[PDB]
Amino acid sequence: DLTATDLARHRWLTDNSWTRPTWTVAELEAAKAGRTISVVLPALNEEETVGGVVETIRPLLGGLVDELIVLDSGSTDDTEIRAMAAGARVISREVALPEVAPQPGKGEVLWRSLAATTGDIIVFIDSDLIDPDPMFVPKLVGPLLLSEGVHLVKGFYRRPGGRVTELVARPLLAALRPELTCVLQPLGGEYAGTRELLMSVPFAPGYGVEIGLLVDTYDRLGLDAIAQVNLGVRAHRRPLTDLAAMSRQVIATLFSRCGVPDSGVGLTQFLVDRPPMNTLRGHHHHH
Template sequence: MKLPVQTWFDRATSRARDWPLDRLRADKGRTRVSVVLPALDEEPTVGGVVRMVRRLADDTGLVDEVVVMDSGSTDGTARAAEAAGAVVHHRDDVLPELGSRPGKGEVLWKSLAVTTGDVVVFVDADLVDPQPQLVTGLIGPLLADPSVELVKGCYDRPLKGAGGSSGGRVTELVARPLLGRFFPELAGVVQPLAGEYAGRRRLLEAVPFSGGYGVEIAMLIDTLRLRGLGAIAQVDLGRRTHSHQDTAALGRMAAQITHVVHERALGATGSTTAVTQFARDGYGHYAPVTHVMDLAERPPMITVDGYAHRVAKVS
């Protein structure tokens, strides 16, 4: 007898090649698709990702707009994105009356206020070899099945010098064990922290957006609670090549993810978390360095004054 995880996995998992362009075009109809790239100091790579999406839009008509959300870059990220054909919004210019916060979750949340898609695809801006299936695979289940509301990407993530598919260290060491303990229904999700995923606007505007790196796993858990496991699907996108962070940065990421899961599973309170790490000082001795991270959540966008009116006006 199959375990529930295996049953969901078999039903909800597809491959990018299962969604050929002809089928996608037939299923798209009048559905608008927005592709959003959150970016912070990604000048070397953001242009290549935007050009890939723009080619897909021009050649197939499957993408209606390409938006880069600048999270406070100090390099030429915005210029590179605009030159490649994206519309660029700086986080400080979107909903300025609500202020701005650092972190990925903030710009993903604000992207809902400046995009028009019925389906929104999120793609990280640090990809080295971006391929169209990162978009076409993710929109496939959403265009084909109205009951699907969130599609997560999964892929091999090669880590230079480690062999095999050794990327995703926080996923395997932190995220998946936590989900297995507290939300076992989600144990079949291969990449719960994947930066490539897509959702229906009606879902994305109904869930809060966690600050920092907890945004993806929070959205997954909140979708389970709000819509049920049947609303979640995943697509094998093949291989994803991108930059990797050092161990200290991964430790801070792990702390944020742990905070978000415990908050949802155990009712833990507080919008900040702190992690103390150790580095050599100028004398060769270890010195503690404490990082305090603000993980305050943004509320569901549908509750923001003026948002519902703006969406109705656009549609």
């Protein structure tokens, strides 16, 4: 028979998941009600794709989208200049948050982007996407603009998740936070959140950032605050060593949130969380 996890999943899908997120750009603009929207593309040596991603979002600039920023992580290729020519604002880690020395990894970039943006809603889109669709941003912000109580929207793709998602993230969530197994692509890089939420949570480093944000949001607000939207079809993207490193950090970040100690020992082959940005810039009682 059904479990409590099953029952919650079914109703969460009914209320908080959209297979056909067909809101129009015009209706979303009309719903902003004074809120502004920032779009952030984290980038490190993505010269072949960053411009193409920017180009798909640029038509929204000045209407639905208020700012379009490429947060560069120290690229040595032509990422920055291609993002400039394509119509984005390029901001380095150092300019985004001058008072803190950078550390490596994606989570650092997304955290710093909170200091460099002003939008009430922040949308993250990976800069390595080959086939970005222009409706990604509208779909991601729909539930934030139209659905009471939602603070985090995860974009998922139908396929014509991957290995880390299905072997590592979802099974560990089943063990530790089973309600969150309803989220189809918990590691996805296309997602949006409110400034209120994102400024208030720590940011995990590196490959842990997505899972960390998902679990921190759940632990504070539960499923009601999390939604997901189908962004369309896309094929699964990596070398096993990259995936194993990803997994190891997903494990470390989940463990840090779920009361499991971690040796700190990285993968044998043959760094810390950043505090909430509201400690530097700018309820759901259990009683």
